[PDB]
């Protein structure tokens, strides 16, 4: 294990006709990748490469803020003949699989240990009714409440589970900067697992699903409009962004090829024809001797 701030330098190489030395030949059967250097495969010049590697660090590769949740509910009076339930909120059931870019990028490793910075971005639209005159978006107070595993969830906007005396909650308005906080590495294990070759229950029943991990039960995010209902219908759209920090990554995986279909498993249907079809990942060319983008003069 050596320090690599810049890519390897190239050393000047000479003609070499030596018996018993075959640097260009390797045995792939050992499981070892070819160790052949350019210096010993061709005649090379001295090159002092000052290309930096900091952008290919797993901290930089995974430590960008990615969307992990998009939920939209109608902000209005949901009350009817006999309901008494205001329903101006949503519950998510925390996960990192709903959006494929962060999922496929996280799924390039088996295990990840990171503290996560979260950013919530709310947006309002007036609901296009029969008689609706627009004149501006109310500066509503929102409450995002993390309900951990085994805590009572809210059933209404007006519920008293919103007390949040011990539940972590953040209050933030529409016209303010998007809410932000850091959640620590909060697994019962020493790393998060993107794949579980097993079951999360002690029973052998169908109801006990394959792939579900007994460390991904992370609880729920409950987000409400704190303001009581307006005289008109609004649509609140909430976007939650995840930025992994202080990242450790283990056991790199084969990248996902087929499009995801759900968040409970890694099943696939594949696309009808190449690319990313079950029988053809790379698009077809005419023959093994055909260059599809051959430069013609």
């Amino acid at each position: 294990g050596e320090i690599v701030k810049t890519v390897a330098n190239t050393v000047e190489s000479e003609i070499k006709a030596e018996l018993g030395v075959i640097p260009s030949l390797n045995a792939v059967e050992t499981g070892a990748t070819s160790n052949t250097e350019p210096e010993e495969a061709i005649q090379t010049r001295t090159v002092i490469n000052m290309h930096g590697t900091a952008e290919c660090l797993v901290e930089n590769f995974l430590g960008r803020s990615a969307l992990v949740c998009m939920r939209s509910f109608e902000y209005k009076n949901h009350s009817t003949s006999t309901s008494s339930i205001q329903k101006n909120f949503f519950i998510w059931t925390l996960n990192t699989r709903e959006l494929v870019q962060i999922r496929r990028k996280m799924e390039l490793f088996t295990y990840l240990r990171f503290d996560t910075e979260i950013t919530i971005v709310p947006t309002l639209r007036l609901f296009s009714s029969s008689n609706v005159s627009f004149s501006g978006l109310p500066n509503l107070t929102l409450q995002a409440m993390y309900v951990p595993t085994g805590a009572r969830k809210p059933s209404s906007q007006d519920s008293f589970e919103w007390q949040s005396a011990c539940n972590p909650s953040v209050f933030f308005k529409i016209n303010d900067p998007p809410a932000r906080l850091t959640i620590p590495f909060m697994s019962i294990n020493s790393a998060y697992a993107n794949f579980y070759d097993g079951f999360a229950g002690f029973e052998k029943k169908a109801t006990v699903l394959y792939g579900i991990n007994p460390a991904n039960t992370m609880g729920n995010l409950c987000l409400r409009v704190v303001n009581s209902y307006q005289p008109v219908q609004y649509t609140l759209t909430v976007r939650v962004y995840m930025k992994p920090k202080h990242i450790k990554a283990w056991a790199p995986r084969a990248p996902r090829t087929m499009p995801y279909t759900n968040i409970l498993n890694n099943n696939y249907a594949g696309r009808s024809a190449a690319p990313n079809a079950p029988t053809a990942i790379v698009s077809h060319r005419s023959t093994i001797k055909t260059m599809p983008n051959d430069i013609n003069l």
Binding site: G31, S190, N267
Partner: protein, 239 residues
Amino acid sequence: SDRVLQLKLGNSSIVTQEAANICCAYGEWPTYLPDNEAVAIDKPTQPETSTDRFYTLKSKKWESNSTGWWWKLPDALNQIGMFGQNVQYHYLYRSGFLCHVQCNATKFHQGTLLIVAIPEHQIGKKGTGTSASFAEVMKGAEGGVFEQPYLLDDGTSLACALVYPHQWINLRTNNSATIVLPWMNSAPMDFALRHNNWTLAVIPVCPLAGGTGNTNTYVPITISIAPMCAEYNGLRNAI
């Protein structure tokens, strides 16, 4: 040193003369759980010779149209010998695995197998939302077959399976592959009956063939797995 190897664990000793090397997964050898990493406070049972020895599983016929085979550890050895009994009688297990795949053919035969140790290999099923059943996932010593080896039965690629600890059996060069697996879990121990740390997969990348008088030759593939530094915690009745 050479292309010859003898593996000796307890009662067991395997010899090969057409070897390539020993693949130590992530350049690590299995070791016993230290105190700094220990969770379960009860004194563990460390049966060396009775568990840490080569268990040979039932062989598989390499066919011209063979898609490939996988064995999930420790599920493959959970109903075999004293490793099985210690699993049945304990809540928690920890062990590495020395896996040794064997395949004999003539100098006139051609064919290549990729032998992959995949950690936390979650099987994806083609053309359904329904996740794989207990039966499909837990096949024990008999192991399972690849339906989509091209996709590693994961919606991933066979192409990129070389990230994983692997060797090849190329009948030109090699009749045997050897992969040393260390403990691979986010936790120090686990429940053997409901989670598999590793999946040993044997995929034919180049098919088995011969010339005019070496076609339809009976060529089996034998797998021998040795638990390494096996530990058990939570002594109870047998499950």
